[PDB]
Amino acid sequence: KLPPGWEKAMSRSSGRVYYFNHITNASQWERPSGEPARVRCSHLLVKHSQSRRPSSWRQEKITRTKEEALELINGYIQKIKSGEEDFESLASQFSDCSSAKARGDLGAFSRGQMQKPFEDASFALRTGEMSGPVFTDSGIHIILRTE
Numbered sequence: 001k002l003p004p005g006w007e008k009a010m011s012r013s014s015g016r017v018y019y020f021n022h023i024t025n026a027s028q029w030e031r032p033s034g035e036p037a038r039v040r041c042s043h044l045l046v047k048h049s050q051s052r053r054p055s056s057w058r059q060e061k062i063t064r065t066k067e068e069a070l071e072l073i074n075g076y077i078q079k080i081k082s083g084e085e086d087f088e089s090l091a092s093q094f095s096d097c098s099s100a101k102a103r104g105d106l107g108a109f110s111r112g113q114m115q116k117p118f119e120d121a122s123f124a125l126r127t128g129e130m131s132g133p134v135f136t137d138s139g140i141h142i143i144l145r146t147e
């Protein structure tokens with residue numbers, strides 16, 4: 001059927017079928033197209049008060065709730081998908097990760113190096129594909145697989 005990780009779903013608001021990936025939290029209308037030793041990804045991290053280190057270059061003390069963090073993530077995803085903003089621009093401006101200064105680029109990595117939900121989403125993404133909200137102990141990620 002579908003490249004594993006993917007399931008069919010029904011829009012509650014339109015009744016149209018769409019596809020959801022439970023590893024990447026990506027969702028799309030089209031039927032999904034369908035592993036390498038390494039992948040390259042960028043990300044945009046929004047931390048919250050329960051993050052492993054509730055601090056970043058943007059904010060000495062990160063006080064926002066997980067819910068508020070997810071709302072910010074959802075808004076970034078919306079602007080990226082509409083083309084109002086580029087992933088790289090939002091990462092540089094708003095990612096709570098030091099990789100903001102590199103447009104969110106983390107370089108290439110193997111399995112075993114990253115936090116598990118991040119790794120699984122990264123490796124389940126296709127080249128050029130973007131995740132939905134991915135939750136780790138650092139916060140909530142938008143992940144872009146670049147290679």
Ligand SMILES: NC(=O)Cc1ccc(O)cc1
Nearest residue numbers: 045097098114115118138
């Ligand atoms: N550690 C991971 O698995 C992803 C990650 C989380 C926070 C960062 O500041 C950079 C990378």
